[PDB]
mmCIF file of C-alpha atoms in Angstrom:
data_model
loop_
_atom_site.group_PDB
_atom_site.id
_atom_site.type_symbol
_atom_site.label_atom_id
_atom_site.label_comp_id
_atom_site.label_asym_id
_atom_site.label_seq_id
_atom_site.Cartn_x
_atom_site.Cartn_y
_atom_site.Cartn_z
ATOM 1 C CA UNK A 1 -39.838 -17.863 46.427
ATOM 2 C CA UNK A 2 -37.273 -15.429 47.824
ATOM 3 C CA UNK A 3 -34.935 -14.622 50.217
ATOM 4 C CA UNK A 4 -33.333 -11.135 51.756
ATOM 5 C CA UNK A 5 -30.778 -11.282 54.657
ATOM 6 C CA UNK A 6 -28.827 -8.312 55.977
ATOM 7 C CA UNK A 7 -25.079 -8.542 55.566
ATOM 8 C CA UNK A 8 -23.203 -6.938 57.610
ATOM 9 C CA UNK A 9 -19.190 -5.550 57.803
ATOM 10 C CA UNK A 10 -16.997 -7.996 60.705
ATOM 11 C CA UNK A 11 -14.378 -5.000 61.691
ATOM 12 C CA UNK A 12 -14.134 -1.121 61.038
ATOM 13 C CA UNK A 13 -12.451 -1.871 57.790
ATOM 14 C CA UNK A 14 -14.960 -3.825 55.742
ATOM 15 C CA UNK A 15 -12.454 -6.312 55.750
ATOM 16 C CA UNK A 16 -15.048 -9.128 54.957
ATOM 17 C CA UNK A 17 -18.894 -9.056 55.534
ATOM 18 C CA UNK A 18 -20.616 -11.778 57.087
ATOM 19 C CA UNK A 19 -24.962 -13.091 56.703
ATOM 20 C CA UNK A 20 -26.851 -15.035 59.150
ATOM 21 C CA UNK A 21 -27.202 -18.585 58.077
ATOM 22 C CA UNK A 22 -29.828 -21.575 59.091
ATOM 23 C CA UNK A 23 -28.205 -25.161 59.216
ATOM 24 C CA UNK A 24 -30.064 -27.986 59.988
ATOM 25 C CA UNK A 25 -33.305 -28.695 62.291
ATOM 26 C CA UNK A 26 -33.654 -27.480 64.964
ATOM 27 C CA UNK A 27 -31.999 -24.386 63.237
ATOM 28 C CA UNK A 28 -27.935 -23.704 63.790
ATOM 29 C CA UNK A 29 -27.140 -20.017 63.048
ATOM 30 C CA UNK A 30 -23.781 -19.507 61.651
ATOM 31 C CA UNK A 31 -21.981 -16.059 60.655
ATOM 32 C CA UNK A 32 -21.130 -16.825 56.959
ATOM 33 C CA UNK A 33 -18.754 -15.148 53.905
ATOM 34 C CA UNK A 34 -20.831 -14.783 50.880
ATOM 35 C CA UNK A 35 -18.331 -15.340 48.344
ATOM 36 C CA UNK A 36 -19.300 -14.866 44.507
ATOM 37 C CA UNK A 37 -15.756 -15.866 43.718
ATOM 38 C CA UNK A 38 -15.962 -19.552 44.927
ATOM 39 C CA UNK A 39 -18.575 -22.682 45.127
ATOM 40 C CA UNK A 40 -18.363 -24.700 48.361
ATOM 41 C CA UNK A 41 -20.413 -23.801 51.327
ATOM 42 C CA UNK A 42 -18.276 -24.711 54.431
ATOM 43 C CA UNK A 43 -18.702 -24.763 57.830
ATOM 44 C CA UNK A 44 -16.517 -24.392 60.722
ATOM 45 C CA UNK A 45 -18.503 -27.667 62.867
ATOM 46 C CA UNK A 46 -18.101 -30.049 65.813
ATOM 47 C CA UNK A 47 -15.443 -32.425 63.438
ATOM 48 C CA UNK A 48 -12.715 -29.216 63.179
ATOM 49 C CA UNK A 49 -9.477 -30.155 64.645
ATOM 50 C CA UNK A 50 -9.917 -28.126 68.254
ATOM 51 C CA UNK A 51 -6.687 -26.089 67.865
ATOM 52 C CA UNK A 52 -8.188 -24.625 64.654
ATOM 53 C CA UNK A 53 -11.149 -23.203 66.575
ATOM 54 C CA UNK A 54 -10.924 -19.985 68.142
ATOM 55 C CA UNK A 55 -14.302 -18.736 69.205
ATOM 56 C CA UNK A 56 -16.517 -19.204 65.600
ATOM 57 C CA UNK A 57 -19.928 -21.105 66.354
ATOM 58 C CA UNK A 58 -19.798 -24.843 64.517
ATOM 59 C CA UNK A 59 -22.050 -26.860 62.837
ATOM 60 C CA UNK A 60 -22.800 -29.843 64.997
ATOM 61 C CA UNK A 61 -24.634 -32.273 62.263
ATOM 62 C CA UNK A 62 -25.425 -35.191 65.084
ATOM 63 C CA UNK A 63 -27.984 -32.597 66.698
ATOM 64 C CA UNK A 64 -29.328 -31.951 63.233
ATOM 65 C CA UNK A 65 -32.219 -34.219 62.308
ATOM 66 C CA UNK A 66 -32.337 -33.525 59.032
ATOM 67 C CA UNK A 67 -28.666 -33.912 58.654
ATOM 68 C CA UNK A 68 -27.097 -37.039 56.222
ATOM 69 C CA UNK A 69 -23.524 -38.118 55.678
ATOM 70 C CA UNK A 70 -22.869 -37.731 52.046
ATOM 71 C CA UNK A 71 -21.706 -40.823 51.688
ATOM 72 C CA UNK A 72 -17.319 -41.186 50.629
ATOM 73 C CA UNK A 73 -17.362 -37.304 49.777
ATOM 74 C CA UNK A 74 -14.873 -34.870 50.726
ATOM 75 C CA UNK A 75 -13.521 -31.786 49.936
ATOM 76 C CA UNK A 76 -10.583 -29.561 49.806
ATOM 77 C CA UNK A 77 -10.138 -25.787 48.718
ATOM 78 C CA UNK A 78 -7.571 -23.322 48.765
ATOM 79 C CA UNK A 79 -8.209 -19.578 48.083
ATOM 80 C CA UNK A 80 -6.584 -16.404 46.045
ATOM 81 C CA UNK A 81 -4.995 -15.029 49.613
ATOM 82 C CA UNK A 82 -3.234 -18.334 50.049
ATOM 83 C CA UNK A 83 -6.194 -19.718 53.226
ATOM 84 C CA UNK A 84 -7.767 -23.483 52.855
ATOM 85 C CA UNK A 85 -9.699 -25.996 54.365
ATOM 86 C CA UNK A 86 -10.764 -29.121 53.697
ATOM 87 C CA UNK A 87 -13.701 -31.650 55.433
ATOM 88 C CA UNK A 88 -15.827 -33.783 55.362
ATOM 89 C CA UNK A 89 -19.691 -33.690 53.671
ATOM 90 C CA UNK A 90 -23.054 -33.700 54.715
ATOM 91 C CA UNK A 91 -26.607 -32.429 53.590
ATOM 92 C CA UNK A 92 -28.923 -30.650 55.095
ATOM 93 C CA UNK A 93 -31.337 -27.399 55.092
ATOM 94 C CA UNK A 94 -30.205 -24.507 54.628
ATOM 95 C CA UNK A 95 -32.148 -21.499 54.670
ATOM 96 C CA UNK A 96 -30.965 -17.761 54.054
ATOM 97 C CA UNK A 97 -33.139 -15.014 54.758
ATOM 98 C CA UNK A 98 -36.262 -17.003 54.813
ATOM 99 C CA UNK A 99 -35.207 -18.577 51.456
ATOM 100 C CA UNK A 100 -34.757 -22.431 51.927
ATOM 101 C CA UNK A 101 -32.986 -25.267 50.298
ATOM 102 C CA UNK A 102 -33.402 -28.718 51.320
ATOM 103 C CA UNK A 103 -30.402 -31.368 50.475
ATOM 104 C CA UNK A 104 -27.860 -28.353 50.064
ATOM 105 C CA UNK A 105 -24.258 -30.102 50.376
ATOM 106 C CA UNK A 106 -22.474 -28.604 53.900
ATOM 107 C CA UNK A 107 -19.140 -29.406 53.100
ATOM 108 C CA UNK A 108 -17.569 -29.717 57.488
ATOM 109 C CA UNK A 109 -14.252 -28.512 57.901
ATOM 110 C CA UNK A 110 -12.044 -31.443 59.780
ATOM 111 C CA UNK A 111 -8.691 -28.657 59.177
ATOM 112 C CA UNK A 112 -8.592 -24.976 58.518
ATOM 113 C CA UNK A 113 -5.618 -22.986 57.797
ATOM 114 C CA UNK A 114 -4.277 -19.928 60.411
ATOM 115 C CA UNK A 115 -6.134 -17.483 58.319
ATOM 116 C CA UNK A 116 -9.604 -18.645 59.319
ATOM 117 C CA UNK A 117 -9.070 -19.496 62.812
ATOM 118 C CA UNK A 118 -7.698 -16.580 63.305
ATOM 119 C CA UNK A 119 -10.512 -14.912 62.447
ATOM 120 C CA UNK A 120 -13.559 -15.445 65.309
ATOM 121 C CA UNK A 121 -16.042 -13.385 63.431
ATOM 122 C CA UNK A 122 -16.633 -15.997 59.993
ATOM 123 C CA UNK A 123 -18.219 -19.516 60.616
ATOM 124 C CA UNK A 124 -17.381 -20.922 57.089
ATOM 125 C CA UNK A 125 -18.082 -19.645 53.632
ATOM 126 C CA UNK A 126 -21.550 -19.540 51.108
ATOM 127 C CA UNK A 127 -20.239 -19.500 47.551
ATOM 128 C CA UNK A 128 -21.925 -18.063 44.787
ATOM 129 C CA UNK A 129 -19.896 -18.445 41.729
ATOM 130 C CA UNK A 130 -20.818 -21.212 39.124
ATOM 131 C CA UNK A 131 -21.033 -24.803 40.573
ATOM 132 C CA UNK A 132 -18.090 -25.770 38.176
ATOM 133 C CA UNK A 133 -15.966 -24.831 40.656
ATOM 134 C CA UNK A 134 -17.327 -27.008 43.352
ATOM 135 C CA UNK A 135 -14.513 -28.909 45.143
ATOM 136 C CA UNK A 136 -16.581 -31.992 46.587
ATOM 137 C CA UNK A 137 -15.052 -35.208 44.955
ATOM 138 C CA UNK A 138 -15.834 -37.694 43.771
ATOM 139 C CA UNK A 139 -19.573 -36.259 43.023
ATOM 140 C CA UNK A 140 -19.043 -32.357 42.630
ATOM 141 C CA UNK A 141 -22.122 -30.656 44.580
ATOM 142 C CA UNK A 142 -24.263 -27.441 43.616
ATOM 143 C CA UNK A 143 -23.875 -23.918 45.201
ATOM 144 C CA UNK A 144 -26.919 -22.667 47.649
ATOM 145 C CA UNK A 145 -27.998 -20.868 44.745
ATOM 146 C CA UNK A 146 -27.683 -23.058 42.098
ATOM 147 C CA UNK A 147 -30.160 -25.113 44.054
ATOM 148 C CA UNK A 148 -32.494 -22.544 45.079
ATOM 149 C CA UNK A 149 -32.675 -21.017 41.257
ATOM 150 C CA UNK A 150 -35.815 -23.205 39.904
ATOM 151 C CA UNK A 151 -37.872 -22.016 42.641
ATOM 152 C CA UNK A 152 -36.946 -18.554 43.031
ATOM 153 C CA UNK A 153 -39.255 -15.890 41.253
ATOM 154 C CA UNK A 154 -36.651 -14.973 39.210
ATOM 155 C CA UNK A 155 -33.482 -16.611 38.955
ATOM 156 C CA UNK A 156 -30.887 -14.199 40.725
ATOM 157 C CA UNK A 157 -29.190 -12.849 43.349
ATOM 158 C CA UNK A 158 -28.280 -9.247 44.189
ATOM 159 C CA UNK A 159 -25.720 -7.557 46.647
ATOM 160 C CA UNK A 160 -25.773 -4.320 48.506
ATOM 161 C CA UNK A 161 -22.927 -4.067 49.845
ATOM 162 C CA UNK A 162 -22.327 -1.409 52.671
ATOM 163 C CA UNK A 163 -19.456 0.972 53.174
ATOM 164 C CA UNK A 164 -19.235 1.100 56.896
ATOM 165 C CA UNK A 165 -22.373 -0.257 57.424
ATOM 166 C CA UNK A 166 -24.857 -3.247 57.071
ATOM 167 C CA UNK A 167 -26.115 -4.068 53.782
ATOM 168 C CA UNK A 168 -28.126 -7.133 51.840
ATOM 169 C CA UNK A 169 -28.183 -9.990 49.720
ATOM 170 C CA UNK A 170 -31.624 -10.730 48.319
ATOM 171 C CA UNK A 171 -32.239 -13.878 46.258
ATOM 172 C CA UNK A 172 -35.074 -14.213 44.071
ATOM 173 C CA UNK A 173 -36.041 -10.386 43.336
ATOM 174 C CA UNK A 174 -34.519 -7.538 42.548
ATOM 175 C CA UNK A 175 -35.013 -4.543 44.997
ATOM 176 C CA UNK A 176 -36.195 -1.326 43.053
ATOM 177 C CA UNK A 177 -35.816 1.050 45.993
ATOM 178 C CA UNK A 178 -32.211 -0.193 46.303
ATOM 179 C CA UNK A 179 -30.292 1.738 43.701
ATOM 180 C CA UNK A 180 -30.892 4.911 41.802
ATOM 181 C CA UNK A 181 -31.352 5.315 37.843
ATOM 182 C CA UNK A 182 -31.269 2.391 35.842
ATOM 183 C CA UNK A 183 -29.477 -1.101 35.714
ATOM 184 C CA UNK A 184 -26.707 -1.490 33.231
ATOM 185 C CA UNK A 185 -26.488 -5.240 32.462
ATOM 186 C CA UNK A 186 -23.336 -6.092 30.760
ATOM 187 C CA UNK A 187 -21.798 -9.863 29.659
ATOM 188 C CA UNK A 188 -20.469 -12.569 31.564
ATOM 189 C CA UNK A 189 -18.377 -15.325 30.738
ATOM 190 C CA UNK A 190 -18.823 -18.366 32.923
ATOM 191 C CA UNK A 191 -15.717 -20.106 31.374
ATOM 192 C CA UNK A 192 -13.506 -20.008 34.287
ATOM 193 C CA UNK A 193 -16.289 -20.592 36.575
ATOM 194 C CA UNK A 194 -16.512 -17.001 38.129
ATOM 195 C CA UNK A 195 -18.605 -13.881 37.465
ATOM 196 C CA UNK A 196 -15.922 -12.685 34.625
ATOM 197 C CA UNK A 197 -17.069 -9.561 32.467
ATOM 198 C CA UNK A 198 -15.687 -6.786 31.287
ATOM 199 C CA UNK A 199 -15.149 -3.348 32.157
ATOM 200 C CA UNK A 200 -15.492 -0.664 29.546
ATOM 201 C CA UNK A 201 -12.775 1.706 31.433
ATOM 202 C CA UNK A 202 -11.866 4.138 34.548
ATOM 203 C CA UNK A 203 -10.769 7.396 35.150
ATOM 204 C CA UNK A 204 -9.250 9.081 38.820
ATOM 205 C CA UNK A 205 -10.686 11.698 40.702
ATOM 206 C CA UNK A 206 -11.965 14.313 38.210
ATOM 207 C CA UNK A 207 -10.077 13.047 35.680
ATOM 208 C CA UNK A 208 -10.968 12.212 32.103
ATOM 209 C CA UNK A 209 -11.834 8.842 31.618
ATOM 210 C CA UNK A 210 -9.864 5.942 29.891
ATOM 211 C CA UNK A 211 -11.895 3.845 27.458
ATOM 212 C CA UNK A 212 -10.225 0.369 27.824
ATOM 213 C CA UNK A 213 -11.248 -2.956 28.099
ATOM 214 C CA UNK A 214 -10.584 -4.450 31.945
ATOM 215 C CA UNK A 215 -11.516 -8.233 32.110
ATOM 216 C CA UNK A 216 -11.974 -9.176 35.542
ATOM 217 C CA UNK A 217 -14.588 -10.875 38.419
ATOM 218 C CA UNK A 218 -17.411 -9.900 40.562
ATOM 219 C CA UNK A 219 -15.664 -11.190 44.010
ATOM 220 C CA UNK A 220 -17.449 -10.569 47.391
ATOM 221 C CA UNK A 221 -14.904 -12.597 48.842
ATOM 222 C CA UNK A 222 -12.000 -10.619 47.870
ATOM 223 C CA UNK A 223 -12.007 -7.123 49.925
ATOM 224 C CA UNK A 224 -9.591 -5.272 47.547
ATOM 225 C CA UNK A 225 -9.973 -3.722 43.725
ATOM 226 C CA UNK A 226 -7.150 -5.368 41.918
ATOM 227 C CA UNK A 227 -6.387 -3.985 38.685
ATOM 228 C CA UNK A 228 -3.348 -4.271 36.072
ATOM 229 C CA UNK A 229 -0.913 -2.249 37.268
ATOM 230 C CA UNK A 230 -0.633 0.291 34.663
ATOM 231 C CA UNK A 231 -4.450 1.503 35.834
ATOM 232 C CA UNK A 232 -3.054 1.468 39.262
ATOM 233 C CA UNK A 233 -0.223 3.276 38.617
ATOM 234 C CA UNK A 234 -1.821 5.968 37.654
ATOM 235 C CA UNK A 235 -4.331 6.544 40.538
ATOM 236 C CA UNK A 236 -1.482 6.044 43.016
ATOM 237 C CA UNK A 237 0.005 8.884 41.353
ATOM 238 C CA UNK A 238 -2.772 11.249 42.278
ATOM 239 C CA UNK A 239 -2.022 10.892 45.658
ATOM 240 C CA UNK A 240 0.905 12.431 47.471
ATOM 241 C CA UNK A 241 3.612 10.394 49.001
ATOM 242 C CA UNK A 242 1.694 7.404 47.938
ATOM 243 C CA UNK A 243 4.438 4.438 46.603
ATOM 244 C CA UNK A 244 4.364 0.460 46.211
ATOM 245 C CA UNK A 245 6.033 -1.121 49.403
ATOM 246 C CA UNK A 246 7.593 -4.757 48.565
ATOM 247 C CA UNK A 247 7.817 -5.172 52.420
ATOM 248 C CA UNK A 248 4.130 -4.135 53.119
ATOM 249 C CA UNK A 249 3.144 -5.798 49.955
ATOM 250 C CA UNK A 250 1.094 -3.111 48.217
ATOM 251 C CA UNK A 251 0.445 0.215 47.418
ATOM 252 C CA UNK A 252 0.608 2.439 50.955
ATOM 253 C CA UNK A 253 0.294 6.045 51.544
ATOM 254 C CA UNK A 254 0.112 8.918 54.091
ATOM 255 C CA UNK A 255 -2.606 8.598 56.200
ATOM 256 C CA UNK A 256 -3.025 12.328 56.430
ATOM 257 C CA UNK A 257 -3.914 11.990 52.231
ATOM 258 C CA UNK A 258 -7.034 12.972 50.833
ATOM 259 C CA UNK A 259 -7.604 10.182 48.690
ATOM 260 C CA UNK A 260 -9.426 10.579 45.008
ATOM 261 C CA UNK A 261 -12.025 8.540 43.845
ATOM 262 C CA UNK A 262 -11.724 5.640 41.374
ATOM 263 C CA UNK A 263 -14.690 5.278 38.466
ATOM 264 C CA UNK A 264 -14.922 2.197 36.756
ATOM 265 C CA UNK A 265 -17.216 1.990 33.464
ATOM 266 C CA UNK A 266 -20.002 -0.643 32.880
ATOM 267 C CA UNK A 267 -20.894 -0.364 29.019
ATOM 268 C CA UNK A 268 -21.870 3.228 29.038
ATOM 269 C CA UNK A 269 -22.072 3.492 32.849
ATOM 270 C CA UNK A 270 -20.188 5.276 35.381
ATOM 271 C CA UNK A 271 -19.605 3.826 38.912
ATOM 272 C CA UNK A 272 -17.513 6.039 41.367
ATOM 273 C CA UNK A 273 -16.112 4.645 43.991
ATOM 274 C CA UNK A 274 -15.514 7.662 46.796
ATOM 275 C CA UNK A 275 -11.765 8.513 47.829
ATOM 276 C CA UNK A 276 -12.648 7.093 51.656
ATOM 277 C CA UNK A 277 -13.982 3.460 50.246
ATOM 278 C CA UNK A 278 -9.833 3.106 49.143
ATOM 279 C CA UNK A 279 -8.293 3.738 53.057
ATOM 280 C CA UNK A 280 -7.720 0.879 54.908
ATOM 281 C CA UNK A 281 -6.069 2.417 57.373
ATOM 282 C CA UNK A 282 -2.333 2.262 59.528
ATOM 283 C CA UNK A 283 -0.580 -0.802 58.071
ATOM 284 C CA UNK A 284 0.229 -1.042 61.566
ATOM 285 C CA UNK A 285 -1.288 -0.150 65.177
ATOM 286 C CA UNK A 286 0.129 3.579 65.304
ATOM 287 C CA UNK A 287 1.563 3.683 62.137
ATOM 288 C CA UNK A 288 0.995 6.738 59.371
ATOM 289 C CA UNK A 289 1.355 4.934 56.897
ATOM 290 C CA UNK A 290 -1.902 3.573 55.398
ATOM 291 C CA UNK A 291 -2.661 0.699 53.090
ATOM 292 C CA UNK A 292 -4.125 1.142 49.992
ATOM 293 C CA UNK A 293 -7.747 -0.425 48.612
ATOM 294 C CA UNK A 294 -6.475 -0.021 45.569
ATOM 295 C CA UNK A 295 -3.756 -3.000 44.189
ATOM 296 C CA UNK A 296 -2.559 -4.276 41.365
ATOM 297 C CA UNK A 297 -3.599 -8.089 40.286
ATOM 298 C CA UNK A 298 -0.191 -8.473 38.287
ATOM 299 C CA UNK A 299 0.931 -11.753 39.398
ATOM 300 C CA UNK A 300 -2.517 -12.473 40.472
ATOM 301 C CA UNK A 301 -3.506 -14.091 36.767
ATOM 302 C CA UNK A 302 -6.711 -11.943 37.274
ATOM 303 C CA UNK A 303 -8.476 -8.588 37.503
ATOM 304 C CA UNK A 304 -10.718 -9.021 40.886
ATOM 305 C CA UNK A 305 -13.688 -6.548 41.281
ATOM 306 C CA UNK A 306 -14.045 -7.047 45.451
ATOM 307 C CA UNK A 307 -16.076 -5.260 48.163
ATOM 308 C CA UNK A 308 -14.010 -2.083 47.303
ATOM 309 C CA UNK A 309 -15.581 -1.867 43.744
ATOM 310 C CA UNK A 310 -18.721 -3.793 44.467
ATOM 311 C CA UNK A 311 -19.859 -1.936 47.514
ATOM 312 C CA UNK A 312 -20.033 1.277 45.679
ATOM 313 C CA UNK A 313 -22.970 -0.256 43.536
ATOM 314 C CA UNK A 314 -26.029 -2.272 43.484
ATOM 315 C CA UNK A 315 -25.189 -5.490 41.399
ATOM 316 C CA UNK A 316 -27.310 -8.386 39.683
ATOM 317 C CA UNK A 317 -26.043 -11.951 39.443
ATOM 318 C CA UNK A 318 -28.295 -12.520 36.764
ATOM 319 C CA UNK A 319 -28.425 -16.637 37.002
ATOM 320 C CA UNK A 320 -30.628 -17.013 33.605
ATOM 321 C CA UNK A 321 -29.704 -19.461 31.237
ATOM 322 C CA UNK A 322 -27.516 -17.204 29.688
ATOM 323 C CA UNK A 323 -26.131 -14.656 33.060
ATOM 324 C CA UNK A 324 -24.743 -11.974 32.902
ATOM 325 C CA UNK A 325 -24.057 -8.887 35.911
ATOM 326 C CA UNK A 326 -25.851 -5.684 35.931
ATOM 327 C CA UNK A 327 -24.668 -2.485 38.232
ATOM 328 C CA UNK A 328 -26.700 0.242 39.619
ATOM 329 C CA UNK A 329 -25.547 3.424 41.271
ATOM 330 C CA UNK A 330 -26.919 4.176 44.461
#
């Protein structure tokens, strides 16, 4: 089997991206974050505390007839940007892009944090990271893919990413119209649970590039590139004006700047990411003063490849028995 869904940016920014998903029967179509950085699929659903909803679409399980209490299970999760949630369980079908799983754990949010209700345009998150990190206790559950992988034609997952535009995830197959040249497939270690390889180096603008080795994850659930802040240092210094702002909390910079573009290596592979992919925009309504895609992960405890990197390439979650990532141009 496969799957392909379009994914598609929530604001102007590509501050998250968000995929039709089908809960339950009759089908329940909810707005979800595909997130290769974490491994519970929740739902914002009829059981959220009221105050904590502010216009998603929920999951209503009691009008699903294929929907079952897992039985004493709950969960509880809290995320790199400092948002959580926690729930109840349930299983039920869930089908992506024509791709279905029966029996596929939706963890039910009963509380959300400010973050998420704040933010009308995600129903709940898909994770695609390694099940290890499943939250759901006392019997830890499987991700959508995990599930899926036995019957797919090929055990993987790819994302498209767009920059200001839609783009896909396709499960199963690997789209050879999508990118241009070739696939570089490089390592990936699974022992933290996340899509962890390493890059091979980077270079800004037209610069020459820096053979070094960056450990870090594949994160569609982080928007930002975060990288030590030696590598950052020196492509904020390319930029006029540009500094690190405490009271922001990042790198900002003059929103009339031309900004350079960023190149990250994959074995012998080049991806460039274009100047414009790195603006995200007034760090206020009004303001000139624009915030940086671009950070550094010091204090972070990790390097985080996220849409700013991984929308400037094709990329294979390669889920064999031994995965690794692969990027693309395109």
């Amino acid at each position: 089997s496969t799957g392909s869904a379009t994914t598609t940016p929530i604001d102007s920014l590509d501050d998250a991206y968000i995929t039709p998903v089908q809960i339950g029967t009759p089908a329940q179509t909810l707005n979800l974050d595909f997130d290769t950085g974490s491994s519970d699929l929740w739902v914002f659903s009829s059981e959220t505390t009221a105050s904590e909803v502010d216009g998603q679409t929920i999951y209503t399980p009691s009008k699903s007839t294929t929907a079952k209490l897992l039985s004493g299970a709950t969960w509880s999760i809290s995320y790199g940007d400092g948002s959580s949630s926690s729930g109840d369980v349930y299983t039920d079908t869930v089908s992506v892009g024509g791709l279905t799983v029966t029996g596929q754990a939706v963890e039910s949010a009963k509380k959300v944090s400010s973050s998420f209700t704040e933010d009308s345009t995600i129903d709940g998150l898909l994770g695609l990271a390694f099940s290890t990190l499943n939250t759901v206790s006392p019997t830890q559950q499987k991700t959508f893919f995990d599930n899926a992988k036995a019957s797919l034609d090929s055990p993987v997952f790819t994302a498209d990413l767009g920059y200001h535009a839609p783009g896909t995830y396709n499960f199963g197959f690997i789209d050879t119209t999508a990118y241009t040249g070739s696939i570089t497939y490089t390592a990936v270690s699974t022992k933290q649970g996340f899509w962890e390889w390493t890059s091979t180096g980077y270079a800004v603008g037209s610069g020459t590039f820096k053979s070094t080795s960056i450990d870090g994850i594949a994160d569609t659930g982080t928007t930002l590139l975060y990288l030590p802040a030696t590598v950052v240092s020196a492509y904020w210094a390319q930029v006029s004006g540009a500094k690190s702002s405490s009271s922001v909390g990042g790198y900002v910079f003059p929103c009339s700047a031309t900004l350079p573009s960023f190149t990250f290596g994959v074995g012998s592979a080049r991806i460039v990411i274009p100047g414009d992919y790195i603006d995200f925009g007034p760090i206020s309504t009004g303001s000139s003063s624009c915030f940086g895609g671009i950070q550094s992960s010091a204090g972070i405890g990790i390097n985080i490849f996220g849409d700013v990197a991984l929308k400037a390439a094709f990329v294979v979650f390669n889920g064999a028995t031994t995965p690794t990532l692969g990027f693309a141009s395109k």
